């Protein structure tokens with residue numbers, strides 16, 4: 001992940017999407033694309049992004065259905081060109097395994113979302129996060145997503161998943177997470193509104209990259 | 219819901235979807251449309267279904283993001299003409315409230331998914347299900363989704379939500395739930411593959427209904 005910085009492109013608008021991303025392409029080669037954009041402009045928006053930019057794309061679909069439906073979702077997502085897909089753990093091991101199977105059958109990647117950055121996450125998710133993380137480990141998951149906003153559960157997550165696993169962390173910028181601190185445990189940070197909304201996308205990104213310049217490489 | 223029967227249109231081919239749904243319109247006026255089809259053909263498939271069949275559409279997106287992102291998803295979804303959207307409870311009250319807001323601010327409905335039909339659901343969901351349903355009641359949620367395959371959990375769900383709430387239940391047909399016993403608690407059953415993968419979907423819909431006959435009306 002170039003500069004350890006993944007853009008969360010949640011603009012809901014094909015033209016502003018391709019424009020903010022084009023304006024920051026110099027700084028990032030990895031884009032997270034979620035339902036805000038995909039439901040607004042269609043799954044073809046993924047390809048148009050691979051063409052224009054030759055970036056990597058993480059489909060942030062928070063897959064959370066029964067195993068049979070999860071398989072269909074993954075299959076469809078990977079057909080539209082996504083390099084990876086983000087899957088919920090709370091639905092349990094069979095739902096996560098359904099995604100893993102399709103991923104490998106198609107040589108792509110699954111990220112397991114173990115925990116979330118918003119206040120409601122404390123209600124049910126936080127209490128299960130350790131067991132969801134261990135479930136991921138037992139399942140052979142290598143990629144994880146954890147919240148930058150509470151650094152101390154990132155650390156626990158790192159404990160459980162080992163330094164072998166790849167960890168990416170949202171909640172940076174808009175939600176108040178510190179990029180520097182997050183990267184103590186996370187391999188890459190995810191940043192949305194801080195970049196794509198601000199007056200000067202390019203400058204907001206470069207300001208972020210400077211702030212963590214001592215954390216770049218390799 | 220006509221004949222208390224909701225078609226889960228999980229065909230991923232547009233042509234096969236528009237056609238099988240066409241063949242059962244006699245029997246059903248409410249279609250659940252989920253990500254298998256939407257990710258294959260686009261959000262426009264919802265409006266198209268609406269302007270061919272004049273049916274209510276439940277957008278089964280198992281919304282499960284932070285509040286900010288949930289809002290964008292609900293807006294995008296309702297703008298493509300969905301009458302309702304299905305939202306996960308596990309991410310907590312703020313995420314669910316986020317959807318309830320767009321819905322109320324757009325005269326639409328939210329369904330709260332409290333518990334699921336697959337074996338994996340026992341891992342984390344089952345243990346939180348009562349508390350998630352109670353959270354639903356407190357938020358003022360009026361529509362719910364619960365699994366037909368675990369009849370004692372349905373009964374339990376009905377206790378908590380009241381007879382005032384609308385309850386729809388999947389897992390009938392393919393996953394082994396019986397329509398009759400389910401409707402003892404649920405207002406409507408959801409049926410997917412046991413209809414849409416049948417040689418004569420029309421026929422299959424009738425066998426379910428004919429067999430449901432004593433539970434029809436009002």
Ligand SMILES: O=c1cc(O)n([C@@H]2O[C@H](COP(=O)(O)O)[C@@H](O)[C@H]2O)c(=O)[nH]1
Pocket residue numbers: 008010034060115116117118146147170171172173174175190191192193194283284287
């Ligand atoms: O726990 C999580 C998991 C996420 O995927 N996200 C996602 O990360 C992005 C954060 O964007 P923003 O930088 O504007 O806060 C959003 O797309 C959101 O859905 C999150 O905020 N918290």
Ligand SMILES: O=c1cc(O)n([C@@H]2O[C@H](COP(=O)(O)O)[C@@H](O)[C@H]2O)c(=O)[nH]1
Pocket residue numbers: 065066069226228252278333334335336363364365388389390391392393408409410411412
């Ligand atoms: O607990 C649940 C919740 C669901 O939404 N569903 C959905 O209901 C439908 C059931 O389809 P089928 O009748 O072919 O089993 C699928 O779209 C599935 O994702 C489910 O099976 N169990």
